[PDB]
Enzyme design. Structure first.
Site, PDB file in Angstrom:
ATOM      1  N   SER A 430       0.812  -1.292   0.042  1.00  0.00           N
ATOM      2  CA  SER A 430      -0.074  -0.130  -0.062  1.00  0.00           C
ATOM      3  C   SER A 430       0.951   1.160   0.006  1.00  0.00           C
ATOM      4  O   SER A 430       0.381   2.204  -0.561  1.00  0.00           O
ATOM      5  CB  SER A 430      -0.825   0.056   1.193  1.00  0.00           C
ATOM      6  OG  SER A 430      -1.865  -1.206   1.113  1.00  0.00           O
ATOM      7  N   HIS A 451      -3.767  -4.720  -4.907  1.00  0.00           N
ATOM      8  CA  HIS A 451      -3.980  -3.930  -3.629  1.00  0.00           C
ATOM      9  C   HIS A 451      -5.517  -4.116  -3.089  1.00  0.00           C
ATOM     10  O   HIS A 451      -6.451  -3.873  -3.635  1.00  0.00           O
ATOM     11  CB  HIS A 451      -3.920  -2.446  -3.859  1.00  0.00           C
ATOM     12  CG  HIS A 451      -4.015  -1.824  -2.498  1.00  0.00           C
ATOM     13  ND1 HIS A 451      -3.889  -0.140  -2.453  1.00  0.00           N
ATOM     14  CD2 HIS A 451      -4.105  -2.141  -1.337  1.00  0.00           C
ATOM     15  CE1 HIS A 451      -3.958  -0.066  -1.064  1.00  0.00           C
ATOM     16  NE2 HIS A 451      -4.171  -1.184  -0.622  1.00  0.00           N
ATOM     17  N   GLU A 463      -7.160  -2.479  -6.388  1.00  0.00           N
ATOM     18  CA  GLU A 463      -6.498  -1.903  -7.301  1.00  0.00           C
ATOM     19  C   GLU A 463      -5.098  -2.681  -7.870  1.00  0.00           C
ATOM     20  O   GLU A 463      -4.567  -3.209  -7.204  1.00  0.00           O
ATOM     21  CB  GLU A 463      -5.958  -0.852  -6.521  1.00  0.00           C
ATOM     22  CG  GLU A 463      -6.767   0.518  -5.923  1.00  0.00           C
ATOM     23  CD  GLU A 463      -5.874   1.677  -5.639  1.00  0.00           C
ATOM     24  OE1 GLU A 463      -5.436   2.491  -6.461  1.00  0.00           O
ATOM     25  OE2 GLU A 463      -5.959   1.842  -4.156  1.00  0.00           O
ATOM     26  N   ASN A 501      -6.131   5.914  -2.179  1.00  0.00           N
ATOM     27  CA  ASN A 501      -5.456   6.315  -1.053  1.00  0.00           C
ATOM     28  C   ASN A 501      -4.741   7.880  -1.441  1.00  0.00           C
ATOM     29  O   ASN A 501      -4.761   8.891  -0.835  1.00  0.00           O
ATOM     30  CB  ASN A 501      -4.278   5.681  -0.507  1.00  0.00           C
ATOM     31  CG  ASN A 501      -4.800   4.589   0.482  1.00  0.00           C
ATOM     32  OD1 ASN A 501      -5.679   3.701   0.114  1.00  0.00           O
ATOM     33  ND2 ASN A 501      -4.254   4.496   1.598  1.00  0.00           N
TER      34      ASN A 501
HETATM   35  C1  ACO Z   1      -7.207   6.033   4.378  1.00  0.00           C
HETATM   36  C2  ACO Z   1      -6.597   4.594   3.909  1.00  0.00           C
HETATM   37  O1  ACO Z   1      -5.590   4.445   3.909  1.00  0.00           O
HETATM   38  S1  ACO Z   1      -7.919   3.501   2.929  1.00  0.00           S
HETATM   39  C3  ACO Z   1      -9.193   2.796   4.156  1.00  0.00           C
HETATM   40  C4  ACO Z   1     -10.305   2.563   3.311  1.00  0.00           C
HETATM   41  N1  ACO Z   1     -11.630   2.424   4.155  1.00  0.00           N
HETATM   42  C5  ACO Z   1     -12.840   3.175   3.972  1.00  0.00           C
HETATM   43  O2  ACO Z   1     -12.891   3.965   3.166  1.00  0.00           O
HETATM   44  C6  ACO Z   1     -13.982   2.772   5.061  1.00  0.00           C
HETATM   45  C7  ACO Z   1     -14.716   1.712   4.664  1.00  0.00           C
HETATM   46  N2  ACO Z   1     -15.742   2.165   3.782  1.00  0.00           N
HETATM   47  C8  ACO Z   1     -16.759   1.563   3.728  1.00  0.00           C
HETATM   48  O3  ACO Z   1     -17.250   0.591   4.353  1.00  0.00           O
HETATM   49  C9  ACO Z   1     -18.097   2.199   2.481  1.00  0.00           C
HETATM   50  O4  ACO Z   1     -19.277   2.136   3.532  1.00  0.00           O
HETATM   51  C10 ACO Z   1     -18.173   1.428   1.299  1.00  0.00           C
HETATM   52  C11 ACO Z   1     -16.733   0.941   0.622  1.00  0.00           C
HETATM   53  C12 ACO Z   1     -18.911  -0.197   1.736  1.00  0.00           C
HETATM   54  C13 ACO Z   1     -19.005   1.775   0.448  1.00  0.00           C
HETATM   55  O5  ACO Z   1     -19.517   1.017  -0.905  1.00  0.00           O
HETATM   56  P1  ACO Z   1     -20.714   1.284  -1.473  1.00  0.00           P
HETATM   57  O6  ACO Z   1     -21.113   2.588  -1.932  1.00  0.00           O
HETATM   58  O7  ACO Z   1     -21.646   0.589  -0.702  1.00  0.00           O
HETATM   59  O8  ACO Z   1     -20.373   0.473  -3.098  1.00  0.00           O
HETATM   60  P2  ACO Z   1     -21.890  -0.021  -3.741  1.00  0.00           P
HETATM   61  O9  ACO Z   1     -21.727  -1.389  -3.568  1.00  0.00           O
HETATM   62  O10 ACO Z   1     -22.984   0.812  -3.171  1.00  0.00           O
HETATM   63  O11 ACO Z   1     -21.404   0.260  -5.330  1.00  0.00           O
HETATM   64  C14 ACO Z   1     -22.716   0.597  -6.178  1.00  0.00           C
HETATM   65  C15 ACO Z   1     -23.412  -0.392  -6.774  1.00  0.00           C
HETATM   66  O12 ACO Z   1     -24.721  -0.391  -6.010  1.00  0.00           O
HETATM   67  C16 ACO Z   1     -25.786  -0.309  -6.601  1.00  0.00           C
HETATM   68  N3  ACO Z   1     -26.977   0.236  -5.983  1.00  0.00           N
HETATM   69  C17 ACO Z   1     -27.107   1.726  -5.680  1.00  0.00           C
HETATM   70  N4  ACO Z   1     -27.875   2.138  -5.132  1.00  0.00           N
HETATM   71  C18 ACO Z   1     -28.578   1.038  -4.738  1.00  0.00           C
HETATM   72  C19 ACO Z   1     -29.848   0.493  -3.531  1.00  0.00           C
HETATM   73  N5  ACO Z   1     -30.576   1.515  -3.264  1.00  0.00           N
HETATM   74  N6  ACO Z   1     -30.145  -0.768  -3.432  1.00  0.00           N
HETATM   75  C20 ACO Z   1     -29.262  -1.597  -4.049  1.00  0.00           C
HETATM   76  N7  ACO Z   1     -28.384  -1.470  -4.867  1.00  0.00           N
HETATM   77  C21 ACO Z   1     -27.872  -0.072  -4.938  1.00  0.00           C
HETATM   78  C22 ACO Z   1     -25.545   0.279  -7.955  1.00  0.00           C
HETATM   79  O13 ACO Z   1     -26.269   0.209  -9.054  1.00  0.00           O
HETATM   80  C23 ACO Z   1     -23.965  -0.102  -8.072  1.00  0.00           C
HETATM   81  O14 ACO Z   1     -24.177  -1.418  -8.674  1.00  0.00           O
HETATM   82  P3  ACO Z   1     -23.305  -1.530 -10.376  1.00  0.00           P
HETATM   83  O15 ACO Z   1     -22.030  -1.283  -9.912  1.00  0.00           O
HETATM   84  O16 ACO Z   1     -23.499  -2.912 -10.396  1.00  0.00           O
HETATM   85  O17 ACO Z   1     -23.990  -0.660 -11.249  1.00  0.00           O
HETATM   86  N1  NAD Z   2      -3.673  -1.217   8.254  1.00  0.00           N
HETATM   87  C1  NAD Z   2      -4.224  -2.342   7.890  1.00  0.00           C
HETATM   88  O1  NAD Z   2      -4.838  -3.172   8.171  1.00  0.00           O
HETATM   89  C2  NAD Z   2      -4.226  -2.481   5.928  1.00  0.00           C
HETATM   90  C3  NAD Z   2      -4.929  -1.917   5.365  1.00  0.00           C
HETATM   91  C4  NAD Z   2      -4.395  -2.162   3.749  1.00  0.00           C
HETATM   92  C5  NAD Z   2      -3.536  -2.922   3.255  1.00  0.00           C
HETATM   93  N2  NAD Z   2      -2.677  -3.443   4.261  1.00  0.00           N
HETATM   94  C6  NAD Z   2      -1.545  -4.256   3.782  1.00  0.00           C
HETATM   95  O2  NAD Z   2      -1.473  -5.655   4.390  1.00  0.00           O
HETATM   96  C7  NAD Z   2      -0.077  -6.029   4.407  1.00  0.00           C
HETATM   97  C8  NAD Z   2       0.094  -6.268   5.836  1.00  0.00           C
HETATM   98  O3  NAD Z   2      -0.535  -7.525   6.210  1.00  0.00           O
HETATM   99  P1  NAD Z   2      -1.098  -7.832   7.731  1.00  0.00           P
HETATM  100  O4  NAD Z   2      -2.287  -6.655   8.286  1.00  0.00           O
HETATM  101  O5  NAD Z   2      -1.479  -9.293   7.798  1.00  0.00           O
HETATM  102  O6  NAD Z   2       0.219  -7.471   8.644  1.00  0.00           O
HETATM  103  P2  NAD Z   2       0.394  -8.267  10.233  1.00  0.00           P
HETATM  104  O7  NAD Z   2       1.518  -7.644  10.807  1.00  0.00           O
HETATM  105  O8  NAD Z   2      -0.808  -8.113  10.797  1.00  0.00           O
HETATM  106  O9  NAD Z   2       0.613  -9.799   9.889  1.00  0.00           O
HETATM  107  C9  NAD Z   2       1.962 -10.259   9.114  1.00  0.00           C
HETATM  108  C10 NAD Z   2       1.661 -11.738   8.748  1.00  0.00           C
HETATM  109  O10 NAD Z   2       2.572 -11.901   7.749  1.00  0.00           O
HETATM  110  C11 NAD Z   2       3.594 -13.197   8.102  1.00  0.00           C
HETATM  111  N3  NAD Z   2       4.797 -13.283   7.361  1.00  0.00           N
HETATM  112  C12 NAD Z   2       5.822 -12.205   8.001  1.00  0.00           C
HETATM  113  N4  NAD Z   2       7.020 -12.293   7.310  1.00  0.00           N
HETATM  114  C13 NAD Z   2       6.510 -13.440   6.367  1.00  0.00           C
HETATM  115  C14 NAD Z   2       7.373 -14.026   5.220  1.00  0.00           C
HETATM  116  N5  NAD Z   2       8.727 -13.895   4.967  1.00  0.00           N
HETATM  117  N6  NAD Z   2       6.734 -15.217   4.615  1.00  0.00           N
HETATM  118  C15 NAD Z   2       5.680 -15.483   4.971  1.00  0.00           C
HETATM  119  N7  NAD Z   2       4.766 -14.939   5.800  1.00  0.00           N
HETATM  120  C16 NAD Z   2       5.281 -13.828   6.573  1.00  0.00           C
HETATM  121  C17 NAD Z   2       3.423 -13.038   9.698  1.00  0.00           C
HETATM  122  O11 NAD Z   2       3.707 -14.443  10.223  1.00  0.00           O
HETATM  123  C18 NAD Z   2       1.777 -12.719   9.982  1.00  0.00           C
HETATM  124  O12 NAD Z   2       1.175 -13.916   9.703  1.00  0.00           O
HETATM  125  C19 NAD Z   2       0.692  -4.831   3.993  1.00  0.00           C
HETATM  126  O13 NAD Z   2       1.325  -4.896   2.624  1.00  0.00           O
HETATM  127  C20 NAD Z   2      -0.231  -3.809   4.215  1.00  0.00           C
HETATM  128  O14 NAD Z   2       0.362  -2.599   3.399  1.00  0.00           O
HETATM  129  C21 NAD Z   2      -2.848  -3.545   5.441  1.00  0.00           C
END
Ligand code: ACO
Ligand code: NAD
Ligand code: NAD
Ligand code: ZN
Lengths: 707, 238
Positions: A430, A451, A463, A501
């Site tokens: 990531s 990803h 991704e 991201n």
């Molecule tokens: C910062 C970092 O490092 S990254 C960390 C990332 N984490 C986050 O962002 C937090 C987690 N996020 C979540 O849990 C959010 O709630 C998410 C990702 C689940 C939101 O996703 P959603 O908006 O639910 O995706 P969704 O499934 O709705 O996609 C749209 C689909 O739903 C359908 N849809 C739209 N409205 C409706 C409805 N009312 N009923 C049923 N289906 C519907 C659309 O038609 C579309 O389908 P299609 O693609 O086949 O045309």
């Molecule tokens: N913050 C999050 O939860 C998050 C969100 C998105 C993507 N990711 C991605 O997920 C990955 C990290 O995974 P994680 O959350 O399980 O980390 P973790 O620390 O929770 O667990 C690591 C795991 O990998 C194993 N491991 C370490 N070295 C190894 C090796 N050489 N061979 C085989 N297994 C090995 C360990 O034994 C353990 O089971 C990263 O690439 C990170 O970018 C994490």
């Protein structure tokens, strides 16, 4: 034959019965376009005029009965002026209503899928016999509208108010079993004996055995419910739907009001109340925005078939490292019929993976959603290991090791010596550059990025990072494998933060400046949530964990100094240095489950520089402007090929509000030009709010992303 | 009911009922009499002092068991060669009793058979409320398929369930011996081939013994531990 069109053929049968079959020549399905409708109009007039007809049957010569029309035509129709649209639907409904008024028993032989108009057609006929494998539903609300061809009129009078709302508000497809349980269909049979069942029933209807005239009547008169029961059934439907759909989606609730109003009317008047709202909705910003999502989907699938042309299917996958991400990738892969090895270094690690694999599968069957046998297939699919003896035939390997450039470069380099030389190697990284990790391998052509988002079994996006040396095949295989894991992949060229991201941090920056400007964060996200986001910026920072957000920041800084580098300490540094890691640590912006604790105000105090007042609208702009602009940059720089892609990359990964279409379509909504101007007003905030040269241009040439 | 399930050869069950049926209108004392009345008769029957004989035998078996555990090395990681009929069974049993086991084989199809039976059984149990879905998880996860010998690095005992072929077994056993600890016990589920004979193909016959299971492996209570001419007391105790 009585009638012969290009989409409909009214052929005569025994005992004076006649079969009206939908067989659109040249296509692969059945949909209600201009032609189809115009012909059915003629087909009916032929029957209605033929004094020999004693019985009518409605069949389909395709795999499906009648699905929805091309989303293309929708866009078109909803563009027409209100008076024209309604006048267009009135004529369309008459075609059905007339067929409903035929002085002859009519039966719909539902052989396959029947969505929207397809189902609305059946609702017109008297009786209905459906195949045991077929499905029927009204997926209108998904387009920001509701049944337009008398759906909201007949359904409630056929299956009941409570059920009609439950069927329309959800637009869910309904199976044969549940279809008969609510009486949407009168009889269920098998694909081979369907034609027989229909023909038979008709004869009985004609013979007078079954009072077809009495069965039709119900959907011609007012609802059966009392006056108290209406209010009871309706006010609750509104309260329920609205409390789950959200204020941003009018369709669902409006569907109820439409039924609640024409609760004492006959067909015709009821139809009016239907088009009344349908016309309004088609014009709402939500409709043509969701419809935009679908239009994007179409492109995604069109660009998908091109991938499958050379994509090598994966029959044996392998993931490196169990636990959090490991157990997830492993779970998903197996849960979708694709064996996978769960390699690790210590037994404890694998113990972790196998653990989560259980909880999930368990919880599924534990709620009847899964079969114990099914769970067996899944668990047996996952195969633990600590060596590379079985990697001899693995097609694709997804490395989920620790976030460490040094480490991954060693693992990936190691595994490459235990697999076929035409085996694809992926990296769930990531924060590390794929193109960088690829320099450690000997066959980088096969190395790409895959990803996934935490939790791996909840996030729809995947991704597919295409490294500088990643071959089109190395990518095609990845996507296919991601799509087969019930995910929605989107190819993104390697770059700090990729797409999701990379676009989310500027959004967080706008959040940092707001808090650093004396703005209550509790008020901030309370607005962003009202906007459309699932979780507000603050609450999200806790979910991801400040400890993470802090790291993610430093990474983007080195990535794009010209604009993603701040010299002042943000509210992040404050919480981080104060050891308020977030929801995972119990304390972050909030206290944990979601509570507000004044103990935070103190920590952030050092960050609040100016006490700049701000309106609710500005807040939205301090956030959305940076995000949209960055989404554009990713597109401009070529990080993502098309607009639809970069826009969906959010809808799936970032959870971008659906009724707003996306970051890019949000611009097209406001106005490419009006957007640039609005962005200039905040220009004093930073290079993050400075429109791109390419933007200002298209903003002047009246150009638009999806326009 | 009882008689139709117990059998004519076992009087105790039925007699217990007659004893209760008789003293159905009596007080304590009188009821007690009807009790001893039959108890006295049964104690003399040929069935009684015969079953009691089984128990007396069991006692010896357990007496001779403690002597085994004195030098018997517990098995924390087992391994079976060849899935399917016998494979899926040994694998099932081992895991079902809290002992991880590798299910090695040559072709994917083989392992598929093993994993198949492992399901049916575990499934049928929970399917009958007799087992917990969670427990079934522990079991299945215990069984670990494979086609190589990469994880055999710490296997304590290996049960060979290959085809009934002297030539074949002699090769398999000889091969596996080069992928396990030199103090790891190797067993042979053979039924018609001499263990002492298969043992001459190995390098460390001292650790080779026979472990004969009966089909189905999950129904038969006996497990003949064939002690080859070179089988050490420890190789057997384990
Ligand atoms: C910062 C970092 O490092 S990254 C960390 C990332 N984490 C986050 O962002 C937090 C987690 N996020 C979540 O849990 C959010 O709630 C998410 C990702 C689940 C939101 O996703 P959603 O908006 O639910 O995706 P969704 O499934 O709705 O996609 C749209 C689909 O739903 C359908 N849809 C739209 N409205 C409706 C409805 N009312 N009923 C049923 N289906 C519907 C659309 O038609 C579309 O389908 P299609 O693609 O086949 O045309
Ligand atoms: N913050 C999050 O939860 C998050 C969100 C998105 C993507 N990711 C991605 O997920 C990955 C990290 O995974 P994680 O959350 O399980 O980390 P973790 O620390 O929770 O667990 C690591 C795991 O990998 C194993 N491991 C370490 N070295 C190894 C090796 N050489 N061979 C085989 N297994 C090995 C360990 O034994 C353990 O089971 C990263 O690439 C990170 O970018 C994490
Ligand atoms: N008749 C019975 O059911 C019965 C009763 C008691 C004992 N046994 C014993 O069971 C054993 C036979 O087992 P079976 O019933 O599974 O026979 P089987 O023919 O049904 O299956 C043989 C299995 O062994 C695998 N195999 C063959 N050569 C292998 C090798 N070199 N390495 C790894 N796997 C290999 C095959 O792929 C296959 O999965 C014999 O020792 C026999 O004496 C059988
Ligand atoms: Zn810091």
């Amino acid at each position: 034959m009585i009638y012969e069109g290009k989409a409909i053929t009214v052929t005569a049968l025994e005992s004076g019965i006649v079969e009206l079959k939908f067989d659109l020549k040249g296509e692969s399905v059945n949909k209600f376009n201009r032609l189809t409708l115009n012909e059915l109009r003629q087909a009916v007039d032929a029957i209605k005029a033929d004094a020999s007809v004693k019985g009518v049957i409605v069949s389909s010569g395709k795999d499906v009965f009648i699905v929805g029309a091309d989303i293309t035509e929708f866009v078109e129709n909803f563009k027409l002026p209100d008076a024209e649209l309604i006048a267009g639907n009135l004529e369309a409904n008459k075609i059905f209503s007339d067929f409903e008024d035929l002085n002859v028993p009519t039966v719909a032989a539902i052989n396959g899928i029947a969505l929207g108009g397809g189902l609305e057609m059946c609702l017109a006929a008297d009786f209905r016999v459906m195949a045991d494998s077929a499905k029927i539903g009204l997926p209108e609300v998904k387009l920001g509208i509701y049944p337009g061809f008398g759906g909201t009129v007949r359904l409630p009078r056929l299956i009941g108010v409570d059920n009609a709302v439950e069927w329309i508000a959800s637009g869910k497809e309904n199976r044969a079993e549940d279809a008969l349980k609510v009486s949407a269909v009168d009889a269920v049979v098998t694909a081979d004996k369907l034609g027989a069942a229909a023909l038979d029933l008709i004869k009985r209807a004609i013979s007078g055995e079954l009072d077809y005239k009495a069965k039709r009547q119900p959907k011609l008169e007012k609802l059966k419910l009392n006056a108290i029961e209406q209010m009871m059934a309706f006010e609750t439907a509104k309260g329920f739907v609205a409390g789950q759909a959200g204020p941003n989606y009018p369709a669902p609730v409006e569907a109820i009001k439409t039924i609640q109003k024409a609760a004492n009317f006959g067909r015709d008047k009821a139809l009016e109340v239907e088009a009344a709202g349908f016309a309004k909705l088609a014009k709402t910003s939500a409709s043509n925005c969701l419809i935009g999502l679908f239009l994007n989907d179409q492109e995604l699938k069109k660009k998908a078939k091109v991938y499958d042309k050379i994509a090598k299917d994966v029959k044996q996958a392998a993931v490196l490292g169990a636990g959090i991400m490991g157990g997830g990738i492993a779970y998903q892969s197996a849960s979708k019929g694709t064996p996978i090895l769960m390699k690790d270094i210590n037994e404890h690690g694998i113990e972790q993976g196998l653990a989560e694999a259980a909880k999930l599968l368990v919880g599924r069957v534990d709620k009847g959603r899964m079969t114990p046998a099914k769970m067996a297939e899944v668990l047996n699919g996952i195969r633990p290991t600590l060596s590379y003896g079985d990697f001899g035939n693995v097609d694709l390997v997804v490395e989920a090791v620790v976030e460490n450039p040094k480490v991954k470069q060693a693992v990936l380099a190691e595994v490459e010596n235990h697999v076929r030389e035409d085996a694809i190697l992926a990296s769930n990284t990531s924060t590390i550059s794929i193109s960088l990790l690829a320099k450690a391998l000997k066959r980088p052509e096969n190395f790409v990025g895959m990803h996934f988002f935490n939790p791996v079994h909840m996030m729809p996006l995947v991704e597919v990072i295409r490294g500088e040396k990643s071959s089109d095949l190395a990518v095609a295989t990845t996507v296919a494998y991601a799509k087969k894991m019930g995910k929605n992949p989107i190819v993104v060229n390697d770059c700090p933060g990729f797409l999701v991201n990379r676009v989310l941090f500027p959004y967080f920056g706008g959040f940092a400046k707001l808090v650093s400007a004396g703005v209550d964060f509790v008020r901030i996200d309370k607005v962003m949530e009202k906007f459309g986001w699932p979780m507000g910026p603050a609450y999200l920072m806790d979910v991801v964990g400040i400890d993470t957000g802090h790291h993610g920041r430093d990474v983007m800084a080195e990535g794009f100094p010209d604009r993603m580098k701040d010299d002042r300490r943000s509210a992040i540094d404050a919480l981080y240095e104060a050891k308020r890691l977030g929801q995972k640590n119990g304390k972050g912006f909030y206290a944990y489950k979601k509570l507000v604790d004044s103990s935070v105000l103190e920590v952030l105090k050092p960050i609040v520089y100016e006490q700049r007042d701000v309106t609710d609208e500005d807040i939205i702009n301090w956030m959305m402007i940076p995000l949209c602009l960055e989404t554009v940059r990713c597109l401009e720089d070529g990080i993502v090929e098309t607009a639809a892609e970069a826009d969906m990359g959010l809808v799936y990964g970032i959870g971008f509000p659906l009724f707003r279409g996306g970051a890019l379509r949000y611009i097209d909504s406001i106005g490419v030009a009006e957007f640039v101007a609005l962005a200039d007003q905040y220009a004093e905030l930073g290079a993050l709010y400075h429109p791109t040269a390419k933007l200002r241009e298209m903003a002047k040439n009246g150009q638009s992303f999806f326009g």
